[PDB]
Design an enzyme around this catalytic site. Structure first.
Site, PDB file in Angstrom:
ATOM      1  N   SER B  18       0.725  -1.499  -0.373  1.00  0.00           N
ATOM      2  CA  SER B  18       0.332   0.190   0.155  1.00  0.00           C
ATOM      3  C   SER B  18       0.895   1.119  -0.008  1.00  0.00           C
ATOM      4  CB  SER B  18      -0.821  -0.019   1.078  1.00  0.00           C
ATOM      5  OG  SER B  18      -0.523   0.359   2.492  1.00  0.00           O
ATOM      6  N   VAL B  67       1.082  -9.594   8.453  1.00  0.00           N
ATOM      7  CA  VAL B  67       1.936 -10.909   7.280  1.00  0.00           C
ATOM      8  C   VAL B  67       2.403 -10.884   9.143  1.00  0.00           C
ATOM      9  CG1 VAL B  67       2.922  -9.677   5.325  1.00  0.00           C
ATOM     10  CG2 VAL B  67       3.948  -8.516   8.144  1.00  0.00           C
ATOM     11  N   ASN B  93       7.660  -8.660   1.256  1.00  0.00           N
ATOM     12  CA  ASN B  93       7.958  -7.178   1.610  1.00  0.00           C
ATOM     13  C   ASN B  93       7.904  -6.143   3.136  1.00  0.00           C
ATOM     14  OD1 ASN B  93       9.091  -4.069   0.291  1.00  0.00           O
ATOM     15  ND2 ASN B  93       7.074  -3.927   1.233  1.00  0.00           N
ATOM     16  N   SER B 145      17.621  -5.827   3.468  1.00  0.00           N
ATOM     17  CA  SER B 145      18.401  -3.916   3.136  1.00  0.00           C
ATOM     18  C   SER B 145      19.825  -4.703   3.869  1.00  0.00           C
ATOM     19  CB  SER B 145      17.448  -3.847   5.042  1.00  0.00           C
ATOM     20  OG  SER B 145      18.555  -2.428   4.976  1.00  0.00           O
ATOM     21  N   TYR B 159      15.908  -4.570  14.360  1.00  0.00           N
ATOM     22  CA  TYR B 159      15.457  -4.417  12.503  1.00  0.00           C
ATOM     23  C   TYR B 159      17.646  -5.199  11.973  1.00  0.00           C
ATOM     24  CZ  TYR B 159      15.213  -2.349   7.659  1.00  0.00           C
ATOM     25  OH  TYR B 159      15.297  -2.253   6.857  1.00  0.00           O
ATOM     26  N   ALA B 161      18.936  -7.376  12.960  1.00  0.00           N
ATOM     27  CA  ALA B 161      18.446  -8.731  12.806  1.00  0.00           C
ATOM     28  C   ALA B 161      17.210  -9.537  12.684  1.00  0.00           C
ATOM     29  CB  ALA B 161      18.205  -9.395  14.527  1.00  0.00           C
TER      30      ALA B 161
HETATM   31  N1  NAP Z   1      12.825   2.872   3.514  1.00  0.00           N
HETATM   32  C1  NAP Z   1      14.321   2.051   3.255  1.00  0.00           C
HETATM   33  O1  NAP Z   1      14.873   2.998   2.531  1.00  0.00           O
HETATM   34  C2  NAP Z   1      14.549   0.335   2.823  1.00  0.00           C
HETATM   35  C3  NAP Z   1      15.536   0.949   2.631  1.00  0.00           C
HETATM   36  C4  NAP Z   1      16.500  -1.282   2.430  1.00  0.00           C
HETATM   37  C5  NAP Z   1      15.306  -2.079   3.027  1.00  0.00           C
HETATM   38  N2  NAP Z   1      13.941  -1.574   3.296  1.00  0.00           N
HETATM   39  C6  NAP Z   1      12.687  -2.682   3.416  1.00  0.00           C
HETATM   40  O2  NAP Z   1      11.565  -2.018   2.788  1.00  0.00           O
HETATM   41  C7  NAP Z   1      10.031  -3.006   3.142  1.00  0.00           C
HETATM   42  C8  NAP Z   1       9.198  -1.789   3.352  1.00  0.00           C
HETATM   43  O3  NAP Z   1       9.912  -0.536   3.423  1.00  0.00           O
HETATM   44  P1  NAP Z   1       8.768   1.125   3.610  1.00  0.00           P
HETATM   45  O4  NAP Z   1      10.100   2.440   3.728  1.00  0.00           O
HETATM   46  O5  NAP Z   1       8.185   0.777   1.785  1.00  0.00           O
HETATM   47  O6  NAP Z   1       7.813   0.933   4.991  1.00  0.00           O
HETATM   48  P2  NAP Z   1       6.503   1.568   4.591  1.00  0.00           P
HETATM   49  O7  NAP Z   1       6.501   2.540   3.843  1.00  0.00           O
HETATM   50  O8  NAP Z   1       6.666   2.436   5.763  1.00  0.00           O
HETATM   51  O9  NAP Z   1       5.569   0.436   4.822  1.00  0.00           O
HETATM   52  C9  NAP Z   1       5.683  -0.440   5.101  1.00  0.00           C
HETATM   53  C10 NAP Z   1       4.256  -1.615   4.315  1.00  0.00           C
HETATM   54  O10 NAP Z   1       4.192  -2.446   4.728  1.00  0.00           O
HETATM   55  C11 NAP Z   1       3.195  -2.651   5.378  1.00  0.00           C
HETATM   56  N3  NAP Z   1       2.784  -3.363   6.955  1.00  0.00           N
HETATM   57  C12 NAP Z   1       3.156  -2.756   7.644  1.00  0.00           C
HETATM   58  N4  NAP Z   1       3.446  -3.780   8.964  1.00  0.00           N
HETATM   59  C13 NAP Z   1       2.946  -4.762   8.260  1.00  0.00           C
HETATM   60  C14 NAP Z   1       2.072  -5.948   8.547  1.00  0.00           C
HETATM   61  N5  NAP Z   1       2.149  -6.052  10.266  1.00  0.00           N
HETATM   62  N6  NAP Z   1       1.402  -6.363   7.849  1.00  0.00           N
HETATM   63  C15 NAP Z   1       1.094  -6.287   6.539  1.00  0.00           C
HETATM   64  N7  NAP Z   1       1.548  -4.789   6.288  1.00  0.00           N
HETATM   65  C16 NAP Z   1       2.509  -4.262   6.940  1.00  0.00           C
HETATM   66  C17 NAP Z   1       2.670  -1.305   5.537  1.00  0.00           C
HETATM   67  O11 NAP Z   1       0.732  -0.830   5.507  1.00  0.00           O
HETATM   68  P3  NAP Z   1       0.429  -0.682   6.821  1.00  0.00           P
HETATM   69  O12 NAP Z   1       0.776  -0.506   7.707  1.00  0.00           O
HETATM   70  O13 NAP Z   1      -0.983  -0.026   6.635  1.00  0.00           O
HETATM   71  O14 NAP Z   1      -0.638  -3.159   7.259  1.00  0.00           O
HETATM   72  C18 NAP Z   1       2.684  -0.849   4.125  1.00  0.00           C
HETATM   73  O15 NAP Z   1       2.082  -1.179   2.915  1.00  0.00           O
HETATM   74  C19 NAP Z   1      10.668  -2.681   5.120  1.00  0.00           C
HETATM   75  O16 NAP Z   1      10.664  -4.645   4.995  1.00  0.00           O
HETATM   76  C20 NAP Z   1      12.081  -2.703   5.089  1.00  0.00           C
HETATM   77  O17 NAP Z   1      13.118  -3.557   5.636  1.00  0.00           O
HETATM   78  C21 NAP Z   1      13.382  -0.736   3.448  1.00  0.00           C
END
Ligand code: NAP
Ligand code: NAP
Ligand code: NAP
Ligand code: NAP
Ligand code: CL
Ligand code: CL
Ligand code: CL
Ligand code: CL
Ligand code: CL
Ligand code: MG
Ligand code: MG
Lengths: 258, 259, 256, 255
Positions: B18, B67, B93, B145, B159, B161
């Site tokens: 989303s 999830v 993801n 990550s 995180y 970990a």
């Molecule tokens: N942004 C970065 O720089 C970066 C870098 C390396 C790795 N990552 C990884 O990329 C992934 C997402 O990062 P992001 O920056 O895109 O975070 P985000 O912008 O906060 O998006 C998180 C998404 O996951 C959903 N979500 C959260 N908790 C959930 C749950 N318990 N069940 C189902 N859906 C859930 C959220 O929707 P709802 O809250 O409505 O459920 C949201 O759609 C993560 O796994 C993160 O570790 C991000």
């Protein structure tokens, strides 16, 4: 409907493109509309591959050149700029893997492998730097290996040395090239069916086949397609990095564990 | 003429699609003609993104699902297998990265992060195994990550970990999935402009931007396009592996390496 | 006539110290004159190991504690500081490796492995932070594994995840702990002859043996000596890092 | 009882007249290991041999170039003559001149590859028979975080050479295992040395703020890591790396 931005009309060099993985990379790029200059020392082998690939969308042509010669690197880039009008992609691929136990390895043995595999990668990148800078979206793809960076195999202490040397070079080169908007990355094949690997003999090929979770030696297209990904505009934020293309071969803790 | 084989008409799941990277992945596959079920907990967020993406080629629908809950993972796969006629690609993801010093992390803090980021990857993969196997070209892409497998950052010891846990899991999962013709790989983004990364504040974003040789934070498309490569038929010989998408962030020895 | 600065008199905890690698770490440190508290859930195994080591230069005693319970972590630290007057070394070692295929692993299966192997490493580190800081030369040694950080092995996808989780934790923890003069590092054993590894059968044990260039499975002393090195004052500039102790096992491009 | 005393064993340290090699040499000498140090500058070898005259193990010098295989053979023969054998080789000699990619000549690349990588291979090859005969041979390579892990503008050839050492030793460890020789590498971060002091105060004042330990390392940090690898107790450690860097490679952002 849409995946990656088309590379049609771009310009590429593949060193050691007459055979093996280099040829599969050239063909992969040519199928995408990239004009490709392949290099090698043997003219007949270059001519046969140019003839074989004559129906591709991008035009594959050859430049006879030894990667160990810095002058041949400069001539290769200049000739490629002349044929295509510029230079967008350099695949630093040429490499050899003769086998010799450490106690048998002569200075000449070691310099032969390090010169082709490592020095020849540095030389083509240096020679191509200004044209790749003018590209505005330069791409260097290095053919490293799992051997060296990850694995050992008796007889290949100098080979593995040279494959790791490529990666040590590119981790710094990536930082020097970033202000020029050139990415540099490396594919690390495991064991791919090629004329070069054929010389290892059948028992080597069986040995590695049985060690691979995917259940087969890889193909030159596997490496060409990884190179292709790195060259896309879509991979502009990927630099200084490695991709292992090996069917899972570096994963198993032990043999039958597969 | 031809770069990769069209993925048009295949079926995918993106957890946490989303917002942020998951939405970027979903859009990237949708633009390739892939039909995508995005999941998340907030229905408004899912509805808005589904509406935002209404004009894409592939059909992006939503499934509200947690999830951390294996039953939701089973429901997600079944809804996807009913809407699309199968399941070919799973992007594990969803994740969260709250920040807390080691001496402040409670058992709940640790389980929340490990459950969403690592347990939620396992459960979606387990739920999809049968449909992925029947696809004959199954693909799993994990959003890991650089943080954890490669770097550290104060406040993210749980995180990091969980991100490394994803990788330890997939190095064995790749071996178990090979006979089923499923590959599993991870993208390791560095720092990517997202709504979640926004909650870290401007000082964090400025700090990270200056650490990146490419000179910018990444985009969600950067990660989507990497997941797209893993999902191609042409990546059939890549499994158990990682790709760092970070503009060179993990390379510099120090800050004249950059400067 | 001088190699490393004697660790005599220092105070260590080894989680999971009654059997296997933990017992080897505990004996290695006790031989160096370190007083050591071992932990475990079974009192009989603790009592028997305390008795077996009762002649060592350092005093080995036991605390019955579950690493998955944070209160037991705290009680363990309090009891060690009560017995020794401080705490210098924590060997976060306790671990289990049940096996199960990806599609058979239940939530409780996964949590059991992550709880012991990862959470229990976090909890003892947390509980020990204060006393380790006051030591002025604190040391944490984590028993991780080649499995997860490096290798895959069918049936251990949750084990491998838990071992890799330790390392992602410690790469950040090493940064948070540096101002406190605590280093944190991991040993990554390959295949070590232990009680727990004997629960894999003779077929698993012979399998890894032919896959190891050194020609043998390792010993618990191999791991204890690695941990001993990290604990020296001479290793104060090593932190957030790993050392694979495996006879070359991760090296071969094929194990034939 | 920490580790088994190494007193009476025989070691070579290439490039042992200054910096890290000197710290390795003094660390082994303090353990009662007789050490032959090599170098090209006799004045620096004599000065170091005299500085260490009080150590329990005896430090003597052989003037030799690591890039020459014949000098490698002579170093090992002279060392076996003085000591009765050879148990430990620290392939440590290295240089790190700086040059941007577009400026590196073929001679610049061969000079760094020749010293840093070829010089490691040649002293290992030369020592193989004597190390095999010892029954507990030990090779310790001084690599670097630069190359295997990090990049730094101006050091693309240096990093290549340090990664080359590791690709070599991952195979060398498998070939050497039947001979009961282990081979590992110490990967120092930034260590206060003479050669490192050539980088200037700007390079000095700036790697310190990026290191979680809060200081540059010392040559003894590297020597003590090399000492661990040399112990009998590290017999089951081969083909492996140990980063000695105060946490320098860890931070996602060094600021
Ligand atoms: N942004 C970065 O720089 C970066 C870098 C390396 C790795 N990552 C990884 O990329 C992934 C997402 O990062 P992001 O920056 O895109 O975070 P985000 O912008 O906060 O998006 C998180 C998404 O996951 C959903 N979500 C959260 N908790 C959930 C749950 N318990 N069940 C189902 N859906 C859930 C959220 O929707 P709802 O809250 O409505 O459920 C949201 O759609 C993560 O796994 C993160 O570790 C991000
Ligand atoms: N095959 C595998 O399993 C595998 C696995 C991992 C990595 N790699 C890497 O893939 C690269 C090529 O491997 P391959 O199996 O495809 O080898 P190959 O089948 O033997 O072909 C090698 C090509 O390089 C050219 N070449 C050789 N020496 C050269 C030189 N001094 N100057 C210019 N060109 C030269 C050859 O042409 P001429 O002989 O006519 O000059 C030939 O076109 C190597 O870098 C290798 O390390 C291969
Ligand atoms: N053996 C190998 O080849 C190998 C290789 C790589 C890594 N490792 C790691 O080395 C560590 C131990 O290995 P091992 O072979 O020595 O295992 P082991 O022989 O089965 O002994 C494990 C020890 O941990 C204790 N333990 C288990 N669960 C516990 C809990 N909830 N709380 C407190 N203590 C607990 C056990 O005592 P109680 O059951 O009575 O509590 C036992 O003393 C593990 O972290 C393992 O992952 C082992
Ligand atoms: N200092 C650091 O921060 C650091 C970090 C990571 C890795 N390292 C590695 O540690 C090693 C030593 O570094 P260092 O800082 O201690 O350098 P250093 O202080 O400049 O000492 C270098 C030593 O190598 C010798 N040497 C140089 N060229 C030689 C040759 N052609 N043949 C034989 N000996 C030669 C030198 O003696 P002569 O000039 O008389 O020959 C000198 O004794 C290097 O391999 C380096 O790459 C250093
Ligand atoms: Cl490398
Ligand atoms: Cl990992
Ligand atoms: Cl890890
Ligand atoms: Cl298992
Ligand atoms: Cl390397
Ligand atoms: Mg040829
Ligand atoms: Mg005492």
């Amino acid at each position: 409907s849409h995946m990656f931005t088309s590379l049609e009309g771009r310009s590429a060099i593949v060193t050691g493109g007459s055979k093996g993985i280099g040829r599969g990379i050239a063909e992969t790029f040519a199928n995408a509309g990239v004009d490709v200059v392949i290099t090698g020392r043997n003219q007949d082998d270059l001519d046969r591959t140019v003839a074989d690939l004559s129906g591709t969308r991008g035009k594959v042509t050859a430049v006879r050149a030894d990667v160990t010669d810095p002058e041949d690197a400069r001539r290769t880039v200049a000739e490629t700029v002349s044929r295509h009008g510029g230079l967008d992609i350099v695949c630093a691929n040429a490499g050899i893997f003769p086998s010799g136990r450490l106690e048998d390895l002569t200075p000449d043995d070691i310099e032969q492998v390090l010169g082709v595999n490592f020095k020849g990668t540095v030389y083509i990148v240096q020679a191509a730097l200004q044209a790749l800078t003018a590209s505005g979206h330069g791409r260097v793809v290095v053919t490293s290996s799992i051997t060296g960076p990850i694995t050992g195999y008796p007889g290949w202490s100098h080979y593995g040395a040279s494959k790791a040397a490529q990666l040590g070079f590119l981790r710094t080169a990536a930082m020097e090239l970033a202000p020029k908007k050139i990415t540099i990355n490396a594919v690390l094949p495991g064991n791919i069916m090629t004329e070069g690997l054929d010389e290892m003999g059948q028992d080597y090929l069986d040995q590695m086949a049985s060690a691979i979770p995917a259940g087969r030696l890889g193909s030159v297209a596997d490496i060409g397609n990884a190179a292709l990904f790195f060259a896309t505009d879509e991979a502009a934020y990927v630099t200084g990095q490695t991709l292992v293309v090996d069917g899972g071969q570096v994963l198993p803790e032990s043999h039958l564990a597969i």
